Amino acid sequence: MAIAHLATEYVFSDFLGLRLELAVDKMVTCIAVGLPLLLISLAFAQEISIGTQISCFSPSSFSARQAAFVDSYCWAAVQQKSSLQSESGNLPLWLHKFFPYILLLFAILLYLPALFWRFSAAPHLCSDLKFIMEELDKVYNRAIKAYPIVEQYLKTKKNSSHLIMKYISCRLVTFVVILLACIYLSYYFSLSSLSDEFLCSIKSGVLKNDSTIPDRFQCKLIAVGIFQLLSLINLIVYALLIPVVVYTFFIPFRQKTDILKVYEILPTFDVLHFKSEGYNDLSLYNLFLEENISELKSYKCLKVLENIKSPMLLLTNL
Amino acid sequence: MAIAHLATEYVFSDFLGLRLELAVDKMVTCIAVGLPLLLISLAFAQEISIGTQISCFSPSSFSARQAAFVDSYCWAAVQQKSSLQSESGNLPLWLHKFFPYILLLFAILLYLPALFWRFSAAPHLCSDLKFIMEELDKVYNRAIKAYPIVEQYLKTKKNSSHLIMKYISCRLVTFVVILLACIYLSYYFSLSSLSDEFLCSIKSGVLKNDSTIPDRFQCKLIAVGIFQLLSLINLIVYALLIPVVVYTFFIPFRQKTDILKVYEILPTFDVLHFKSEGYNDLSLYNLFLEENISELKSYKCLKVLENIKSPMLLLTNL
Amino acid sequence: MAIAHLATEYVFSDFLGLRLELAVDKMVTCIAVGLPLLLISLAFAQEISIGTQISCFSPSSFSARQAAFVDSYCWAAVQQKSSLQSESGNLPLWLHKFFPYILLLFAILLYLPALFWRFSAAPHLCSDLKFIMEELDKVYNRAIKAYPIVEQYLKTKKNSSHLIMKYISCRLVTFVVILLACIYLSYYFSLSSLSDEFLCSIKSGVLKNDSTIPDRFQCKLIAVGIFQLLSLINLIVYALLIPVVVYTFFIPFRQKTDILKVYEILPTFDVLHFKSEGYNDLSLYNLFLEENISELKSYKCLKVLENIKSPMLLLTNL
Amino acid sequence: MAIAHLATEYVFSDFLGLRLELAVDKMVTCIAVGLPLLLISLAFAQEISIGTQISCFSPSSFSARQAAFVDSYCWAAVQQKSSLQSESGNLPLWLHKFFPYILLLFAILLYLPALFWRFSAAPHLCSDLKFIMEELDKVYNRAIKAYPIVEQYLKTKKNSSHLIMKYISCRLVTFVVILLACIYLSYYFSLSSLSDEFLCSIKSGVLKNDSTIPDRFQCKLIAVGIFQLLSLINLIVYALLIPVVVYTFFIPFRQKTDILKVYEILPTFDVLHFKSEGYNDLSLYNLFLEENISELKSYKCLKVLENIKSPMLLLTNL
Amino acid sequence: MAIAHLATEYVFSDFLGLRLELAVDKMVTCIAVGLPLLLISLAFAQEISIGTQISCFSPSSFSARQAAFVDSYCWAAVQQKSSLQSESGNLPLWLHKFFPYILLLFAILLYLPALFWRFSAAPHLCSDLKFIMEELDKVYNRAIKAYPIVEQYLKTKKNSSHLIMKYISCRLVTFVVILLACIYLSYYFSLSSLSDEFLCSIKSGVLKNDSTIPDRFQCKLIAVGIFQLLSLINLIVYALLIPVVVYTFFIPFRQKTDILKVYEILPTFDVLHFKSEGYNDLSLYNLFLEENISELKSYKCLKVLENIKSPMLLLTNL
Amino acid sequence: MAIAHLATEYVFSDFLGLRLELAVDKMVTCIAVGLPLLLISLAFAQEISIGTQISCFSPSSFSARQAAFVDSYCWAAVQQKSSLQSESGNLPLWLHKFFPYILLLFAILLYLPALFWRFSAAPHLCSDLKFIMEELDKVYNRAIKAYPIVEQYLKTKKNSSHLIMKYISCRLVTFVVILLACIYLSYYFSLSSLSDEFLCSIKSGVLKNDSTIPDRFQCKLIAVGIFQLLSLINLIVYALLIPVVVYTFFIPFRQKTDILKVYEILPTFDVLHFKSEGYNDLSLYNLFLEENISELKSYKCLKVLENIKSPMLLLTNL
């Protein structure tokens, strides 16, 4: 059932009016959090899962309940380091049982920069964006009429580094969580499929005395096959996310258009050579402004006017 | 249960006021994404699925749990390349277990151009469309009263190629995902039905020592019959999608009406011979404008007036 | 559970302010799509389904799992043309397993003309209807005050055939999907009930060697009884739909009232003898207008005034 | 679970601002459709259903799966006229398996007059009601100020018979569906309880050869006991509905108050002796108006004024 | 699960702006309908129900399916008067299986006066209440300024008996449904617990020939214990409802305050000695008015003014 | 699943603009009703419940169905006073099976004072509160401008005792329901854990004759362990509720601030020494007013002004 419902919520909706997240970063966030949550739900859903994550071959002499005991005992035994006879150590077997939680942990860890960003930065930036947009409308309205406060404020943001460091840390945490997940997933996929099989014994002391119980059961972790397939898919996507997040650091290269220069044409505007090669809060505003200025009617008119110029009658014809 | 609910959400709703997607392209997208999601849910739903995707004939000497072990072991074994004795190699058997995920992967891959289009193009175009529509209302209002800014802007769009390349790439990605899916589905349907049957052994070393376990179990993947039927249906539809997407490229042929010529009749309008045989952003606007201009009251009046003409009193009679 | 919920959504709601579909055609569409969706859900719902669609008599010597293997193997075998010993060929047995999907396919196929109509025609017609209604209110307001634009536009629609052909094709596709479904359902109901029983063997080569497995199992497709009952019900309804859709073609006979003649009484209106015996877009508008004009206050007053006449003081008394 | 949810939706809500259905007829409709839907859901709900609708005594020598085969085979056999040894013919056994669908069929058949009435009459009448109400407010406003259009229109409705025949047919269809359901339910309740027991054999030819299978199984349709109880309840209610629907025909006797006479007191009103002993559209309006006039402030004042009279200062004191 | 959800909908919500039901009568209705619905859902919910309503001790020689046949056969047998060997007649055994429906029947029967009251009285009274309230605001506004229409209207209501008889019958039906339910519940609780045990035989003729089947099974209706507890709880509550409904008849004693006398203080009001010891529609209005007048700002001011008096400056100070 | 959903509805929401309940009393109510509902749902939820509330050790010679009969028979037997051999009498065993209903009964009993308070007091008080608040705004507005009606009204409330007795009874009922629940819970927790084990026999007369059935089964009520833990938790909380409700009676001590004295500073206000050591309706208003006056802008200004004073220019500076 779930799969199509999962597509509606997780894929066709922003399940996570200003643009307080950059569309690429928001998509990166939405993809990065969304992919493991979807894959987790897809692994267990009955469209794939035959049943229990684990099963063991009991002796045929066992009652069905005795076999059920072996399965359930060994499920606990998988983590219990004493219990097992793994050919590759206990830790890979833990990782299989842990694996659905481990995907979720990485998903939540990636959500933490998003939740941190929402509280730490979004309303603070929202206050600035609203102020800046309204000053540009005054500049536009005063242009239609035919002091340098907002640019001197943003000049101070070119000196400032406080808010950009909030973004820098937010990006860095996101990158590291992905990178460690990629190495973990790489190891988890590198773990030989044979690890899905392991030997178990219920022969704790009371059962240990019983000669009728076999010295080992042999058992297979059916999900592990599915998990390895899922892990490779997630590794591919996250491996693509790594260079994208690296690109996010290239902020002055990301400042593709100096929209300020479109206003600079106005006599109500100033010589804002604001290519912030200084990695400062202005640079972060400039990227956010590049998206958020697109909201502005004044910007649209001026960009159109700039593009054609590339005026008083035309401005009045507006 | 689900089937009628599935029809409401997936078929009778846009589960994915300006028209920021072309109706055909949106329908193509909605069909292309919707069909596999529906077919996936239909395969597993209890109205079709007898039960587990897999079952094996144990010996009758096996306890029910021993048989359950064989089924679950072999489900993992299907991917485990060492385990099996397939008559056609391991890979077709992987594809059966993978198949419900593989449909979903193609569905999500087709959603990526849609999600890319929403972020990369829709608000950017929306800004242009709103500007252009409002300029046409000025042209209309100034006609009622009885400079060439928007046409000179759109003239620059006839020089521009940036936004059209966003559409070109969006279309191309969609086409390639379909095409590879069609070849995959063709192979998957071409795979002989006998592949649904495969031989399995639980005889890893501990069980390998046990002489009482048979050297093979024989097993059948019951979903594979349903999947082959579903695959053919999806292949037929997507094979119909391939020429439609090809037609989407024929943009100047898709520019069926020069709505600009309806405004060209006005003295407040200009000689816009704007058959963009140059594949440029203007051409993309022209298609989107052809749909979006239908919103305009002014367009409706002028088209009516043009159709009758095919005026000052009439314009005042409006 | 579902049945009463199904009644609320599918029967007591439009699960599919202008009237952009004709009430009869919309009801025809809603009935035609709704009936199979309801019947599908009713077949499987536990209020009717005993359990699995299929069961086989194993030997009593079989373990319960061995019997479960026979059922599940034979479910796949039903489509597998090699497997069976059907008394009436493989194809009828496919149709039983396919049958719930086949009803849904016809339902979706009938939805395609509806979805096509929504995109291809509804907003285009909506633009015309709004224009025409507003012109009639001007005619009414100008009557209260005491040029032929809309009638000359609609005169051109009497020349035009583009939009009517969209309706013609929409109706024709709907008719053909029903007709083929009726012939399919007729065959499916004509298929002798004995087809519900079929012989199966699990004796692929590994099992073929085993002498203990019987040469055949005998099996019954329990849903097939329910499906035949459902098929007859659906056939009856759709057989009633066939003449209704035929009647939809009789468009000039469907033009029961020349509402234009009610306006023709006005000196602000013209000699619209618009019985469109020419099957042209005007005729399609006339039917849609016949429903949609009922919205108009002016129409209501004029129809009342016409009916009484069957005036200046009365018009002022309004 | 469902029962209390069922009460909220089906009993405490109108699950089906003008009063476009008569309250009695709407209640009759809501009761008539609601009762079978509720009873169907109550029959199957686990608060009553032990399990499967059917069970058979296998031999104790049968495996549990062999017994499950007998149950499922015989469920299909119940409709299969060849299969059985019924003491009262095949048809009563069909009726038991069919019975939950048959209740639903009658429910939907009764919904058809409601759905027909909604489309065929409700908006047409709504247009008339709004017109008539607004004319009465003019009569009231013109009374406060201190031509016979609406009464001459309604006089023509006294000549007309078109809309009343829509109601007549709507009532007649509803009556006949109930009546046939009552006779069916009477027969179904009259069917002796022993019919719940029937003999079955799986001895189609392959099984027919097997001597170990018994010549008959004996089987009981557990729901049939519940269904007979439910059928009697539904029969009682519908038997009460029959005289109510008959009363609905007595339209001039249903015209309990000539509300027009309350307006007739006004000098802005006329001698409307409109006891429509002629069964004409006016009569149908009069009943609908009797409910719908209750909306009117003017009516309330005039009825109050009439009741006290049973005035200019008082009218001004309003 | 359900229990806390049941509390939210049934207990913490009005699951059934004027006060068109008296708060006590509405609470009586809500309690009376709500209690059985809650108790029904509580009986079956898995927090109480072990499983099936019925079970029988088969012979240990029976297969599990043979035992399942005995349970299911005997469930039908409970109503089948021929089948059983009850120590107290068949009818008590019917009542156990019927009992969950019987509670619901009483619940719906009590809802009928509520649904009848909603349609038969609530909008009719609503029209009167709105009129009366607005006349009192005129009296208040005309007091601030410093004919007897509404009191002469209500004087006629003191002559009238039509609407009070609607209430009288509504109350009487509610009382009788409760009373018969109480006697039924009293009998059902009085029925000795041993009735939960009953003897059954599957020995209809085919099974009757089989000597291996026992002459009786012994069976216990596990719900009957729960039902007897529930029945006593419901009996206690409804026994408390009986005197409350009796009190509802004491309408002139229920007319605790002559709110009219608070207005009688005004010179814009009259000598309304309206203790309606005549059981007439005025009396019913007086109770409804007593609640509904509490809405009025004017009433609040006058009651405050009366209470202090117990004025022109004060009225102006308002 | 439920637990986190339960937290959202029951813990993070008011599942039960004036403040018509005191925040402490509302929290007391919400806690008191909420705790048992949550604990009930937590007991049965599969995160805790192994399965059925009851199980018995059958002989190993019993078929699984025979064992299922023993469990289900004994579940009924627990209440049936004849059946058992309890070491501590029948009544403790009833209490275990009854216990989930008994918690709910206490929860609903505590809801009754809340539902009584909502109907009996909340709208009556709401009328008073709105009046009093608006009079204080007149006093404030008349202060800004620079008769004793509301204080003389509230003086009469100091004479009155009618509404306070509604609160007194509401509090008293709540206290008694808690107290009896605490004694019941104390007994239920005091009941020795061994009571969870009890002996049962199915040897009613038909089974009594059978020598193969054991003279006793031994059985354990698995929920009883969970219930005892839950009972102690609920007892602790309710034991804390007892002194809180006692404190609610200390109304003049609860009148922590004479907000009236803040207005008394005004020349538009009077010497309201309204420490209602007379337990009268004024006292109840004073507590409700203490919360509800916090709404008032005027109060906030005056309290601020009082706190600073602890003025005409300042009042104008407002």
Coordinates of all heavy atoms in Angstrom, one line a residue, chain B residues 32-47:
Chain B
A32 N 3.3 9.6 -16.8 CA 4.6 8.8 -16.8 C 4.9 8.4 -15.4 O 5.4 7.3 -15.1 CB 5.7 9.6 -17.5
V33 N 4.8 9.3 -14.4 CA 5.0 9.1 -13.0 C 3.9 8.2 -12.4 O 4.1 7.3 -11.7 CB 5.2 10.4 -12.2 CG1 5.4 10.1 -10.8 CG2 6.5 11.1 -12.8
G34 N 2.7 8.6 -12.8 CA 1.5 7.9 -12.2 C 1.4 6.4 -12.5 O 1.0 5.6 -11.7
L35 N 1.6 6.0 -13.8 CA 1.4 4.7 -14.2 C 2.2 3.6 -13.4 O 1.7 2.7 -12.9 CB 1.7 4.5 -15.7 CG 1.6 3.1 -16.2 CD1 0.1 2.6 -16.1 CD2 2.0 3.0 -17.6
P36 N 3.6 3.8 -13.2 CA 4.3 2.8 -12.4 C 3.9 2.8 -11.0 O 3.8 1.7 -10.4 CB 5.8 3.2 -12.6 CG 5.7 4.7 -12.9 CD 4.5 4.8 -13.8
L37 N 3.6 3.9 -10.4 CA 3.2 4.0 -9.0 C 1.9 3.2 -8.8 O 1.8 2.4 -7.8 CB 3.0 5.4 -8.5 CG 4.3 6.2 -8.4 CD1 4.0 7.6 -8.0 CD2 5.2 5.5 -7.4
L38 N 1.0 3.4 -9.7 CA -0.3 2.6 -9.6 C -0.1 1.1 -9.8 O -0.6 0.3 -9.1 CB -1.3 3.2 -10.7 CG -2.7 2.5 -10.7 CD1 -3.3 2.6 -9.3 CD2 -3.5 3.2 -11.8
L39 N 0.7 0.8 -10.9 CA 1.0 -0.6 -11.1 C 1.7 -1.3 -10.0 O 1.4 -2.5 -9.7 CB 1.8 -0.8 -12.5 CG 1.0 -0.4 -13.7 CD1 1.8 -0.8 -15.0 CD2 -0.4 -1.0 -13.7
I40 N 2.7 -0.6 -9.4 CA 3.3 -1.2 -8.2 C 2.3 -1.6 -7.1 O 2.3 -2.7 -6.6 CB 4.4 -0.2 -7.7 CG1 5.6 -0.1 -8.6 CG2 4.9 -0.7 -6.3 CD1 6.4 1.1 -8.5
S41 N 1.5 -0.6 -6.8 CA 0.5 -0.8 -5.7 C -0.5 -1.9 -6.1 O -0.9 -2.7 -5.2 CB -0.2 0.5 -5.4 OG 0.7 1.5 -5.1
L42 N -0.9 -2.0 -7.3 CA -1.8 -3.0 -7.8 C -1.1 -4.4 -7.8 O -1.9 -5.4 -7.6 CB -2.2 -2.7 -9.2 CG -3.2 -1.6 -9.5 CD1 -3.2 -1.2 -10.9 CD2 -4.6 -2.1 -9.0
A43 N 0.2 -4.5 -8.0 CA 0.8 -5.8 -7.9 C 0.7 -6.5 -6.6 O 0.2 -7.6 -6.4 CB 2.2 -5.8 -8.4
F44 N 1.1 -5.8 -5.5 CA 1.1 -6.3 -4.2 C -0.2 -6.4 -3.5 O -0.4 -7.2 -2.6 CB 2.1 -5.5 -3.4 CG 3.5 -5.6 -4.0 CD1 4.0 -4.5 -4.6 CD2 4.2 -6.8 -4.0 CE1 5.3 -4.5 -5.1 CE2 5.4 -6.8 -4.5 CZ 6.0 -5.7 -5.1
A45 N -1.2 -5.5 -3.8 CA -2.5 -5.4 -3.2 C -3.1 -6.8 -3.1 O -3.1 -7.6 -4.1 CB -3.4 -4.4 -3.8
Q46 N -3.7 -7.1 -2.0 CA -4.2 -8.5 -1.7 C -5.3 -8.9 -2.7 O -5.5 -10.2 -2.8 CB -4.8 -8.5 -0.3 CG -3.7 -8.6 0.8 CD -3.0 -7.2 1.0 OE1 -3.5 -6.2 0.6 NE2 -1.8 -7.3 1.6
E47 N -5.9 -8.0 -3.4 CA -6.8 -8.3 -4.5 C -6.0 -9.1 -5.6 O -6.6 -9.7 -6.5 CB -7.4 -7.1 -5.1 CG -6.5 -5.9 -5.0 CD -6.8 -5.1 -3.8 OE1 -6.3 -5.5 -2.7 OE2 -7.4 -4.0 -3.8

